[PDB]
Design a protein around this ligand. Structure first.
Ligand code: ZN
Length: 44
């Protein structure tokens, strides 16, 4: 029986990244939304 055994749910999702043109930080597709929302124009 799996008492301490964990059958890990496969996360076969490579998350893509791009740097934010104005901030310069690498944004993953998972974080693009919250970053884009909270980011400031002129963030340096
Ligand atoms: Zn940004």
């Amino acid at each position: 029986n799996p008492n301490a055994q964990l059958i890990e749910d496969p996360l076969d999702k490579p998350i893509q990244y791009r740097v934010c043109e104005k901030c310069g930080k690498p944004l993953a597709l998972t974080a693009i939304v919250d970053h884009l929302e909270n980011h400031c124009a002129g963030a340096s």
